[PDB]
């Protein structure tokens, strides 16, 4: 019966204490406070409710945090859409972050390209054996192709863990209690 409690801020406080996330969101949507949303998200994460955290993240436009959640959550799919958003938004730091999570080194080399760093675009294509585009970079950069001092050793990006599960885990398992 929080509906009748007097102050919206107090209602929010009680919802959180009773672990009532549904009521907390109602006070959150209205109170539309930056600090409030942050406390709610923190409460969602404490219960393992990634779905809610995602919800609050989208509306509050915190894409990089959205991407990180899709990562630990195994939401391979949604993780690409975050690329299209970080792209159509001019944020190289982000379109690049999603490639660290997607392990899409082909996109990453390309990102470094428009990113204004041919040397890195090259470094990626090279270590990942994409000999084709690597030269196109060298060419496009007017680089000797023989003065390119690579490190003693390289490796393609194969050390990255993969989703063991099938479907993303939207909420963590909780008892009826």
């Amino acid at each position: 019966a929080l509906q009748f409690v007097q102050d919206p801020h107090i209602r929010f406080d009680l919802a959180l204490e009773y672990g009532n996330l549904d009521a907390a969101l109602d006070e959150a949507k209205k109170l539309n406070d930056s600090i409030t949303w942050e406390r709610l998200i923190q409460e969602a994460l404490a219960q393992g409710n990634a779905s809610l955290a995602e919800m609050i993240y989208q509306t509050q436009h915190s894409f990089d945090k959205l991407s990180f959640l899709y990562l630990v959550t195994g939401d391979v799919n949604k993780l690409s859409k975050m690329q299209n958003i970080a792209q159509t938004r001019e944020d190289f730091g982000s379109m690049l972050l999603n490639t660290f999570y997607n392990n899409s080194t082909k996109e990453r080399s390309s990102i470094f390209a428009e990113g204004g760093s041919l040397p890195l675009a090259y470094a990626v294509a090279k270590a990942n054996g994409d000999e084709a585009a690597a030269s196109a970079f060298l060419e496009q950069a007017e680089v000797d192709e023989q003065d390119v001092t690579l490190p003693d050793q390289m490796d393609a990006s194969n050390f990255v863990q993969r989703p063991v599960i099938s479907k993303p885990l939207e909420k963590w398992p909780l008892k009826e209690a």
Partner: protein, 271 residues
Amino acid sequence: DVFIFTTATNRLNYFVGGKTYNLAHYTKEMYLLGYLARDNKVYLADREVHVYGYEISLEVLEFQTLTLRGEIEEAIENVLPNVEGKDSLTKIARFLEGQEYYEEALNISPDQDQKFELALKVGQLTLARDLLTDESAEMKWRALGDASLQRFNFKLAIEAFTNAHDLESLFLLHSSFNNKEGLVTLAKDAETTGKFNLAFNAYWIAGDIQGAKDLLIKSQRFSEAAFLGSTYGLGDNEVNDIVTKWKENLILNGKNTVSERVCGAEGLPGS
């Protein structure tokens, strides 16, 4: 060919090849008297006829005349041998730098700082490195790393950024060249520096799940550690320990009721 002159503002300047250089400035109206090749100095005088003399380098003036005329080699082989002291050499060096002649300026300059800087400009990377020891300036090692990376010399960039302790740039290199030990070392470094995001990403690309997990735990982000753990098959025993800590933390924060509703690896759909 070089016009020396006094200004209405009390300055003693000289003009050559369209350029104007300051020699000095006085607190009284000065009037140019003349130049004595013998004493190698200009002479001025105020209204009350007090004579002043300023020493100029005829060699330096001539070196400049030639350079701005498109005859620098001529200046380097004929005038430069008669230039005395490094104060004059440094002048010519900084004048040459201010003229895009980085190459030759590098050869003339006695000032080590300028040399290092000039070397980067002309791509003489090796020379530059072999010009910095434990030369504090991490800001110089970075400048060196950037220079090297610009000229596709990754091997050197990697060394520069490492000594420069520039974790952002080093991460771009080790992550591109999938150097697992570099990444893992950088992460630990990032943690020490509070660079929590960088650290996680370093551990991630390195494939160091265990490192990434512990990072999340040291930040009291237990649920997230649990997601990471189960999503990337760490194992039920493993996942359950994270859950146990997640639950203990909850109780320490007074959320006992929520603490007891949290399931272990069992409740996770098809482990």
